[PDB]
Amino acid sequence: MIQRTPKIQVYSRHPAENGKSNFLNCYVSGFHPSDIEVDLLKNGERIEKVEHSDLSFSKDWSFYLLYYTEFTPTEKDEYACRVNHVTLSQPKIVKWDRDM
């Protein structure tokens, strides 16, 4: 069966400026099948109030989903996106870099 690896991008909705409310996003796309595990991490810990868009797909049939949570960045705090899918050996962790 067809199995496609999810591309991952972790970023904020608006440019991140410390002390101001924002939304941390982790967008997964180009994957197949649909079951995938996406967690947003604050300094290693898992974030609880994380939502995601309704499962949809592209013309080539591969899926995409947006996971997100409200957050207020700081100089100190590190954020990340941990993802797991059949196509991944171990969970894939991608760090939030303001400049990306």
Binding site: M1, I2, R4, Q9, F23, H32, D35, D54, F57
Partner: protein
């Protein structure tokens, strides 16, 4: 200018874990407006855009009715196909259906679509002429022959050329301020030191709608395609999109590079430069 409406359906079997999960979503251009989730508590087609919330119970009940019907159809479809392919009752499988229509700048019918994929692989598709079918494998042949015999195409043609385009126009009107809007991208550039003789120049496109955009870099006005890291356009989460393109520039050569931004909401394409 042009517009489109699309309905995406995903059914995934949960062998030994209840009935298959069904997800249905509807889009007008790049804006989702409805959705149904079989695992959800309401069991109703729900609004996802502001302009569709005030449609009325007749609309909601009718769509809820029809979407449930789509669910029941896909449920049987999963069984049909595990059979068609000789697969076991243990495995989880996926059916994907997509139908919709495109209208041109003049709002008249342009293209219709109706197709399925099984486990991420094309199964059957209604051709552009809306009269024939492109059947994938040997298994899809049964389906194609069946659909040809029953004259499914003509029935589909009627919807795509009629109801689909008609409701798209209505939605376009209903939600004119969102759907008939264009948000030009907010652009900016970032410089990051790599080594002692190299730096990354990244060109940003933020808060734009619709999703279509062309972001490219040039050196002395020469293409730099193969040398540009260009990410996939991504959703900001508030209805707009984002995208970036970057080049690793040899120190002292910043002035040679120009970023070009093309988008529907721009009065003229942009030429950005680090200086």
């Amino acid at each position: 200018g042009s517009h489109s409406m699309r309905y995406f359906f995903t059914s995934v079997s949960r062998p030994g874990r209840g009935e298959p999960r069904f997800i249905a979503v509807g889009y007008v251009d790049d804006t989702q407006f409805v959705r149904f989730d079989s695992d959800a508590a309401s069991q109703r087609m729900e609004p996802r855009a502001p302009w569709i919330e005030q449609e009325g119970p007749e609309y909601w009940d009718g769509e809820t009715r029809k979407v449930k019907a789509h669910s029941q159809t896909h449920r049987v479809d999963l069984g049909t196909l595990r059979g068609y392919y000789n697969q076991s009752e243990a495995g989880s499988h996926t059916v994907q259906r997509m139908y919709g229509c495109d209208v041109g700048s003049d709002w008249r019918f342009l293209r219709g679509y109706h197709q399925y994929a099984y486990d991420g692989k094309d199964y059957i598709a209604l051709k552009e002429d809306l009269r024939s079918w492109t059947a994938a494998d040997m298994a899809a042949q049964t389906t194609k022959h069946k659909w040809e015999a029953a004259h499914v195409a003509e029935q589909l043609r009627a919807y795509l050329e009629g109801t689909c385009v008609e409701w798209l126009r209505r939605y376009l009107e209903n939600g004119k301020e969102t759907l008939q809007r264009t948000d030009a991208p907010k652009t900016h550039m970032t410089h990051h030191a790599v080594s002692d003789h190299e730096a990354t120049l990244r060109c940003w496109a933020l808060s734009f709608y619709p999703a279509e955009i062309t972001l490219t870099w040039q050196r002395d006005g020469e293409d730099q395609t193969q040398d540009t890291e260009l990410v996939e356009t991504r959703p900001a989460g508030d209805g707009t999109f984002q995208k970036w393109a970057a080049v690793v520039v040899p120190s002292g050569q910043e002035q040679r590079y120009t970023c070009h931004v093309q988008h529907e909401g721009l009065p003229k394409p942009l030429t950005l430069r680090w200086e």
